[PDB]
Hints:
The complex is a heterohexamer, with 3 copies of chain A and 3 copies of chain D. By secondary structure, chain A is mainly alpha-helical. Chain A has one helix spanning 3-19. By secondary structure, chain D is an all-alpha fold. The complex binds chloride ion and zinc ion. Chains A, B, C: This is Insulin B chain.
Amino acid sequence: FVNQHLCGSHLVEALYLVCGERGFFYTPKT
Amino acid sequence: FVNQHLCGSHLVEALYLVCGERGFFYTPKT
Amino acid sequence: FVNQHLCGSHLVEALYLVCGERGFFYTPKT
Amino acid sequence: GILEQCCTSICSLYQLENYCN
Amino acid sequence: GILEQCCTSICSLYQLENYCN
Amino acid sequence: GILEQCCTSICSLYQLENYCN
Ligand SMILES: [Cl-]
Ligand SMILES: [Zn+2]
């Protein structure tokens, strides 16, 4: 299954919400 | 994994769609 | 769990993005 | 609740309807 | 179908492209 | 990274905050 890929979609949407105008970097690094 | 948390996101989006102007209460209660 | 149902939601959103004005058919057929 | 009922297996529009006001 | 192919493992943009009209 | 930390278990708003610029 693609658990990680689906989860990541929700993560950036949460970052978009929490980080606001400040923005954020998304680097899927182990 | 966060199956439940991810699923719940889709649930409220479905409730938003099905319930319309009536609205809905979301209470994650076992 | 509803892995497939949740995944499919993200799939059509991806098709919407990749296919653009051309559109697409979504037929969950095994 | 709705999490146990609808994340375990799929809820139909009719089942979701019962969660609406 | 697309569910078996793209929910089991990730589909690339190129693979998704083949589902477009 | 954020995938291992927040997809394994839930990250709080406070944890997410630390990923913001
Ligand atoms: Cl999901
Ligand atoms: Zn999702």
